[PDB]
Design a protein around this ligand. Structure first.
Ligand SMILES: OC[C@H]1O[C@H](O[C@@H]2[C@H](O)[C@@H](O)[C@H](O[C@H]3[C@H](O)[C@@H](O)[C@H](O)O[C@@H]3CO)O[C@@H]2CO)[C@H](O)[C@@H](O)[C@H]1O
Ligand SMILES: OC[C@H]1O[C@H](O[C@@H]2[C@H](O)[C@@H](O)[C@H](O[C@H]3[C@H](O)[C@@H](O)[C@H](O)O[C@@H]3CO)O[C@@H]2CO)[C@H](O)[C@@H](O)[C@H]1O
Ligand SMILES: OC[C@H]1O[C@H](O[C@@H]2[C@H](O)[C@@H](O)[C@H](O[C@H]3[C@H](O)[C@@H](O)[C@H](O)O[C@@H]3CO)O[C@@H]2CO)[C@H](O)[C@@H](O)[C@H]1O
Ligand SMILES: OC[C@H]1O[C@H](O[C@@H]2[C@H](O)[C@@H](O)[C@H](O[C@H]3[C@H](O)[C@@H](O)[C@H](O)O[C@@H]3CO)O[C@@H]2CO)[C@H](O)[C@@H](O)[C@H]1O
Ligand SMILES: OC[C@H]1O[C@H](O[C@@H]2[C@H](O)[C@@H](O)[C@H](O[C@H]3[C@H](O)[C@@H](O)[C@H](O)O[C@@H]3CO)O[C@@H]2CO)[C@H](O)[C@@H](O)[C@H]1O
Lengths: 69, 69, 69, 69, 69
């Protein structure tokens, strides 16, 4: 899966449909993987560099693959 | 969903009915989303700015949408 | 539910019956709510002020309601 | 249940059989309680004093009771 | 089980198939044990020394045994 965005988590959002949204770089992306919620918030708090891989590389795009650096 | 309150988490409360209450700004709001419990406490501890979106914007109102920044 | 004790967590204990014990003030109280385990340990570690509400306000008393400050 | 060991967590180990091993003092002990895994690692990271209670007080002994100070 | 790699976590990756990949030393290894996800990210954030034991000691190899120091 190709890299979509790389950078620090600007903000996260818990959605009504139990999905989780992350804003990295110029894109806002969501994931339906519950396990990623605490991981992503931890990355945001500690200022980790995140790389999100997805074919749906556009605002509102879904993803499941994330690299934590 | 419209913004209800924005600010830092004053306090949180675990309720008997397994719901979670948060005090942000001048409102005390609850959520039945179990996944939000650890996320909200983490935000409280680290002093993150939280934005709660809900149509039930009043004390005792329920919510599911939260922005972490 | 009335306030039982308020103060910092002196110590926590995982019990054989999968319950969680907390020592706040002069009371040792337990909870059968699994979700409260990580939350309480986090409060202990970060030195948060905790308020436990319960009608069984005595050593060995059970609780489910907790306020995190 | 009698005290077995008291001290700081030297190291932890996730085992193939989904159990969790902790080295405290001169003993290496394991627990089959999944909820204890994150709690124990947190205690290790923050340098908390841990007290493990078990009748199987010997290397390779199992436990379920832990006191966090 | 023999030691494969020892060192600090270079990076972690959540995969599409719900597995978790870790890069330690010169190897990139994965695990299908969900409980290890938060533990490994915590070790990465706090800079812990990790030792991964596996017979599949090669890039793309699977593991379940990890020592946290
Ligand atoms: O968490 C949401 C979702 O993330 C991953 O899927 C993403 C999109 O949700 C999904 O629509 C997208 O589909 C791709 C096909 O995989 C690809 O073969 C085709 O060429 O393009 C479409 C749309 O661009 O895939 C992305 C992931 O790259 C995850 O796979 C999915 O299970 C779910 O978790
Ligand atoms: O966590 C509890 C609850 O949060 C969310 O619902 C909130 C209130 O609990 C709910 O009563 C409220 O419903 C609104 C509708 O959104 C609105 O369209 C209609 O006109 O009036 C009712 C009554 O105010 O909605 C808020 C959230 O905006 C969440 O949606 C719900 O599933 C549940 O988790
Ligand atoms: O975690 C265990 C338990 O916590 C809460 O219950 C507490 C005690 O365990 C329970 O014995 C106690 O019962 C009360 C009644 O609620 C009250 O109506 C009556 O007058 O007195 C008895 C004896 O004190 O209630 C406390 C809670 O205040 C929680 O409610 C329960 O579900 C369970 O999780
Ligand atoms: O996590 C593993 C396991 O921990 C606890 O059990 C421990 C040993 O695994 C168990 O063999 C041991 O049994 C004791 C009897 O309880 C005691 O009555 C008798 O005198 O001696 C035997 C052997 O020493 O007990 C320890 C706990 O003290 C936990 O109880 C168990 O459910 C499980 O989680
Ligand atoms: O998390 C994935 C996986 O990790 C552990 O298994 C690893 C490999 O996935 C598995 O193929 C490998 O199997 C070995 C046998 O242990 C060995 O006895 C035999 O001779 O060769 C095969 C092929 O290398 O073992 C490693 C771990 O050592 C874990 O055991 C497994 O349940 C699963 O979680």
């Amino acid at each position: 899966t190709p890299d979509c965005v790389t950078g620090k988590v600007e903000y996260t959002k818990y959605n009504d449909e139990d999905t989780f949204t992350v804003k990295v770089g110029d894109k806002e992306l969501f994931t339906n993987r519950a396990n990623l919620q605490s991981l992503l918030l931890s990355a945001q708090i500690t200022g980790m560099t995140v790389t999100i891989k997805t074919n749906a590389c556009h605002n509102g795009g879904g993803f499941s693959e994330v690299i934590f650096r």
